Amino acid sequence: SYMLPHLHNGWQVDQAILSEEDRVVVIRFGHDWDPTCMKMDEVLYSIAEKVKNFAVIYLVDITEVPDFNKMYELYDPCTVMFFFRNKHIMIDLGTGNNNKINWAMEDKQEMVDIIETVYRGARKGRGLVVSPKDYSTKYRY
Amino acid sequence: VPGLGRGATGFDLNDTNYDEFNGYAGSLFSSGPYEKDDEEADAIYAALDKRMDERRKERREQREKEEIEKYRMERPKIQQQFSDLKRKLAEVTEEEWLSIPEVGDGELDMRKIGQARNTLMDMRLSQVSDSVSGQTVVDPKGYLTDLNSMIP
Amino acid sequence: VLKQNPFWWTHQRHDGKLWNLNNYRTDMIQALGGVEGILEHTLFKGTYFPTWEGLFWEKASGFEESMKWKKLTNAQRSGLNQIPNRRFTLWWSPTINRANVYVGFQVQLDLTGIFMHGKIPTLKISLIQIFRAHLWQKIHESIVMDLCQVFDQELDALEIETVQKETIHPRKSYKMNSSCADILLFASYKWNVSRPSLLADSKDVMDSTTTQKYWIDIQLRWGDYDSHDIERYARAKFLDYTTDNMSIYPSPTGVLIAIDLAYNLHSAYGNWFPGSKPLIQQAMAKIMKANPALYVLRERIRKGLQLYS
Amino acid sequence: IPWKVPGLPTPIENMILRYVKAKADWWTNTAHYNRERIRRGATVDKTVCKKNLGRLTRLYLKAEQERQHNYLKDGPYITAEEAVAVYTTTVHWLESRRFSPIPFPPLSYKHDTKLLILALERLKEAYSVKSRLNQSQREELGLIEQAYDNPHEALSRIKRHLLTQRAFKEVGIEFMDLYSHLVPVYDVEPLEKITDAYLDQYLWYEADKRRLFPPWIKPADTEPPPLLVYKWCQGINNLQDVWETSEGECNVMLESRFEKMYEKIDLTLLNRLLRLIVDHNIADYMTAKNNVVINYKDMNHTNSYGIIRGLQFASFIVQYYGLVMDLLVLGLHRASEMAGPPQMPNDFLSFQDIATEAAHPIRLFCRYIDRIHIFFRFTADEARDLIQR
Amino acid sequence: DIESSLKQLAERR
Amino acid sequence: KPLPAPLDGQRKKRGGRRYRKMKERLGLTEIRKQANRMSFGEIEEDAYQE
RNA sequence: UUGGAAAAGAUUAGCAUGGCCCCUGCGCAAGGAUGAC
RNA sequence: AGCUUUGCGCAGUGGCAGUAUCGUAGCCAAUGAGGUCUAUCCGAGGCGCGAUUUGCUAAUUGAAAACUUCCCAAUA
């Protein structure tokens, strides 16, 4: 399915990041067949219209669009990238690297909170924002 | 325009392309100086590999075919399960496709015998209960009226 | 009821209270080391409260009157719920930020002399809030100016020609590896100097040498629970900086005063001359009693701990 | 709920039906597998448990709707002669006890205000202070305080509801997710909650005034469950030569649970039994309160077979219906020997005379809410006769 | 649009 | 309905007047003392009553 | 005059306007009764 | 010509304001909303959803809480 819009070349990506001025651009780098990307994209579609006011989601295929692999260290099976007014926003998830999510959370509310915090920090002017949760521990007991 | 045309700077090595064994997938000599001699060498080495596989080729291929046939017969792929309905779905007019709406909008009654048996049990219980003399009951309407009159 | 009841078998009103843990709490306090023994693990001594009898916390107060009623977002609610964890971590910092608890990862705080044993972002944020706006440098500056003022007010009484304001690099305040000079005393007559002794060493043995220029150094430290002994720290750092190669002193003879802000302690071990002992003693007393920068540090710590008297 | 799109062509509709069937099979199987994993003790996060609870909730309400429809189709499971036998047993017991039935709460009831205050205090106690209440909780608090301010109008309204009201609103349902087993939790409309609470208080007070429930029916309010265990052990130990085994005597301790006690309660027979002890209007109200709609988020069904247990007076019903089973387990003779004569009743574990205590194989009986503990003592001859049978 | 991604998914799986 | 875009305007520009009734409805003058206080030293009621 | 050096704005409180209502005055619309050789 | 009424708006005094003040794009409504009194009787909006503009001043926190080059020494 994947009703979320897709970008088929680097040109689409680099004018999609600059297209939004009052909304956070979300880019999922990965592959549809990849299950983890499947989980994240299901979560995103579950909240695609909830964050329409202040966020936008685009799906980018690594094979179709491989130019960002070296610059963004796109070596994981899947990454999630946050941009605002041409500036990347780093998120302090507690996983060691603040640039990309690199994992698929099943709860859509966690992603909603993450994108809301990113928007709040980007409109205020901070380039690095703190996640309102710690993902170092999976919280499984 | 490249990816730098956005004016951005960085802050298949993908884990998918890498396997702990065999390392990274993909031949390192996929392209290069390939000519007639290279084709001959590849043909010779492929023939050697086929000859090596000939040791158990018949039984191995027979077992593989039997195993895959039984695996497909036991567990069918979901596309195989839905192919029947997919093909039966072809017989549909294009006029009916525009008609798909949105989501905005003999025989025996099983209840009658249950109600009959329940009423029979109730009648039997009432017949037995009529022998009980000490039961108390008040007049609902009468009591209410008194309540009415009692309101200050 | 959607809340699971553990005391389903009894009612407080009908059966009464069948258990009592008041003596349990008393014995817990005694076994943990008494009230003061427990408080030694905390920042209570860092607040400089004279006594703990009349104090009280402020549960659910925060910086915004706790902002309890609102249309706040779930993430904001999580942050508000995590704020008391920040208060708890700040309270128990002296006993969990020590190297015994966490091995390795000894990273000094930015523009601050505090070392962070273990990556505790909560404590990092709390300490940054406490020491905002270069509070360490301001505290050291205030201490050095106060000591210079005290020495000038008692200049001729101890045969001191004058005092000197040494050019100090900003980092010196939070420079632990090396050190420098803070105050230089110049004399009209020779100062006979004594052998090194602690601030509490009433009896000192006189050294058979004299000097004309005398250095005074001020070192501020944030001691954890295991290393809150100010005298040992002062002695070790005096014997290190004097015989160091990246630390240059104007004279071999001088005094080094170490001040523990986390526990409000102070001690000097350097070389002393007659008449300087009481002057330095009352100077330290008055500077712990009425320093403006130290008072601001105490007030910021109290606000972070939400503890008031 | 039915799903039938009118304009959807039948091939696409059949494909959607097949897809829903396959996804439902996978959904049910994975819900059961996740429940087994969680109950076993596997490490799981919050999302998994939450999802599983939701799935299980949907599955359990599906099964409950199926059970209710099966009861409606297959009629009452209790046979007519079985029901009249139970009724005769109960009436013989109550006549033997000379039990005077509990009258309808009198308008000038001397203790009505106290019972209403107790019910309101119990209802307010259930609302632990969290400062974040939904509309239903704040509405219940408003009704509670309004009734507390003016007890008399609330009492009149409650009596009017007991006399006239027989149709009620939907009862919400939720599941306490104890990892061993889900526990039903029922949310009732606040006015109905107040009426049920007052009725429960009145019923319990009047029953304990008339000694309706025999001593063996626990949980009694005079001993915590540990004290119940202690008294049970001492009563076991205080029987005449209970530990003697020279002549082949044998003591038997049987514990049971009365499986599906709550679910398998016939509302018609329950009403007929309740009319024996309480006023017919009260009995009809109690029975009708059970036959209401149980509603989840999008799911609802008419609970017609089993009792609800979310009702405030359900605590009474279980303690009454269970007593009926006691008369089946003990028999009207032995129970009469254990409960004592109506002149002076016996205690929990006591008999008027030793000769009466050993006159029957059953020495001790103790019923919890649904569990039964029975202590028998047999001689060699009695034990071999029972084994032979 | 959706079919373009569906064909890519089916081919790769 | 989509979740409205979060924003942080100026919390308050003027005070007094109606503003006071607003807080009165929610945020009225409570005891504001000995309710959010802990009494660092001693213990109220039982030790672990909670 | 001279010489020399070079929190992306927070939080709380009060007053007035705006909002609503009685009354007053005025304007306007539509009138009501009535006085004058 | 004097006087007066209803309705309306402007201006002003006084008063009210969370059982208060509105929007409602949702629905119903004089072709009758809602009624336990007066029922062969009364006659208006009602129900759900969603809100409670602008200026000035003061105070707190903070090093700085925002209006257009500042500082140091000496004489006049």
PDB file of C-alpha atoms in Angstrom, chain C residues 12 17 19-25 28 35 39 44 52-61 67 69-70 73 76 91 307-308, chain F residues 3 6-8 11-12 22-23 25-28 32-50:
ATOM      1  CA  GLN C  12      -8.939   0.490  58.346  1.00  0.00           C
ATOM      2  CA  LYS C  17      -4.579  -0.776  61.932  1.00  0.00           C
ATOM      3  CA  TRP C  19       0.554  -3.125  61.842  1.00  0.00           C
ATOM      4  CA  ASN C  20       2.908  -0.379  63.000  1.00  0.00           C
ATOM      5  CA  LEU C  21       6.165   0.709  61.350  1.00  0.00           C
ATOM      6  CA  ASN C  22       7.018   3.832  63.363  1.00  0.00           C
ATOM      7  CA  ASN C  23       9.713   1.929  65.243  1.00  0.00           C
ATOM      8  CA  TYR C  24      10.721   0.513  61.863  1.00  0.00           C
ATOM      9  CA  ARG C  25      11.354   4.029  60.551  1.00  0.00           C
ATOM     10  CA  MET C  28      15.962   2.516  59.756  1.00  0.00           C
ATOM     11  CA  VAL C  35      20.133  11.768  60.750  1.00  0.00           C
ATOM     12  CA  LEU C  39      22.648  13.800  55.541  1.00  0.00           C
ATOM     13  CA  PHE C  44      22.288  19.303  53.012  1.00  0.00           C
ATOM     14  CA  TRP C  52      17.845  20.592  59.997  1.00  0.00           C
ATOM     15  CA  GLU C  53      15.147  20.871  62.676  1.00  0.00           C
ATOM     16  CA  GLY C  54      12.924  23.553  61.148  1.00  0.00           C
ATOM     17  CA  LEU C  55      13.320  22.723  57.452  1.00  0.00           C
ATOM     18  CA  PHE C  56      10.734  21.481  54.964  1.00  0.00           C
ATOM     19  CA  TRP C  57      10.556  20.501  51.314  1.00  0.00           C
ATOM     20  CA  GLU C  58       8.115  21.787  48.692  1.00  0.00           C
ATOM     21  CA  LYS C  59       6.616  18.778  46.937  1.00  0.00           C
ATOM     22  CA  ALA C  60       5.214  19.630  43.492  1.00  0.00           C
ATOM     23  CA  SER C  61       6.372  23.247  43.319  1.00  0.00           C
ATOM     24  CA  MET C  67       1.787  24.038  36.621  1.00  0.00           C
ATOM     25  CA  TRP C  69      -3.836  22.382  36.093  1.00  0.00           C
ATOM     26  CA  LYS C  70      -3.492  23.080  32.361  1.00  0.00           C
ATOM     27  CA  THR C  73       0.596  17.932  26.216  1.00  0.00           C
ATOM     28  CA  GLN C  76       4.936  18.053  28.966  1.00  0.00           C
ATOM     29  CA  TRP C  91      19.698  15.672  46.452  1.00  0.00           C
ATOM     30  CA  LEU C 307      14.046  22.938  50.385  1.00  0.00           C
ATOM     31  CA  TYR C 308      13.173  25.929  52.567  1.00  0.00           C
TER      32      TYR C 308
ATOM     33  CA  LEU F   3      -4.201  17.481  16.492  1.00  0.00           C
ATOM     34  CA  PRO F   6       1.500  23.177  19.005  1.00  0.00           C
ATOM     35  CA  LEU F   7       2.448  26.795  19.602  1.00  0.00           C
ATOM     36  CA  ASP F   8       3.696  28.991  22.452  1.00  0.00           C
ATOM     37  CA  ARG F  11       1.247  33.490  28.134  1.00  0.00           C
ATOM     38  CA  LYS F  12      -0.274  36.720  29.450  1.00  0.00           C
ATOM     39  CA  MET F  22     -10.368  32.919  35.624  1.00  0.00           C
ATOM     40  CA  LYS F  23      -7.937  31.587  38.199  1.00  0.00           C
ATOM     41  CA  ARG F  25     -12.506  29.024  38.649  1.00  0.00           C
ATOM     42  CA  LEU F  26      -9.353  26.934  38.387  1.00  0.00           C
ATOM     43  CA  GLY F  27      -6.331  27.943  40.423  1.00  0.00           C
ATOM     44  CA  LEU F  28      -8.171  29.845  43.134  1.00  0.00           C
ATOM     45  CA  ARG F  32      -1.008  27.229  49.596  1.00  0.00           C
ATOM     46  CA  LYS F  33       0.829  26.131  52.755  1.00  0.00           C
ATOM     47  CA  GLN F  34       1.300  22.878  54.706  1.00  0.00           C
ATOM     48  CA  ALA F  35      -0.348  21.037  51.783  1.00  0.00           C
ATOM     49  CA  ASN F  36       2.619  20.916  49.388  1.00  0.00           C
ATOM     50  CA  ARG F  37       5.053  20.992  52.340  1.00  0.00           C
ATOM     51  CA  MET F  38       6.995  17.990  53.609  1.00  0.00           C
ATOM     52  CA  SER F  39       8.308  18.956  57.092  1.00  0.00           C
ATOM     53  CA  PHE F  40      11.867  17.700  56.527  1.00  0.00           C
ATOM     54  CA  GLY F  41      12.466  16.837  60.174  1.00  0.00           C
ATOM     55  CA  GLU F  42       9.583  14.962  61.766  1.00  0.00           C
ATOM     56  CA  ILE F  43       6.810  12.573  60.721  1.00  0.00           C
ATOM     57  CA  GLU F  44       3.085  13.240  60.492  1.00  0.00           C
ATOM     58  CA  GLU F  45       0.559  10.450  61.182  1.00  0.00           C
ATOM     59  CA  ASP F  46       2.055   6.953  60.881  1.00  0.00           C
ATOM     60  CA  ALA F  47       5.453   6.230  59.358  1.00  0.00           C
ATOM     61  CA  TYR F  48       4.395   4.355  56.203  1.00  0.00           C
ATOM     62  CA  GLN F  49       0.640   4.952  56.238  1.00  0.00           C
ATOM     63  CA  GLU F  50       0.699   6.558  52.768  1.00  0.00           C
TER      64      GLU F  50
END
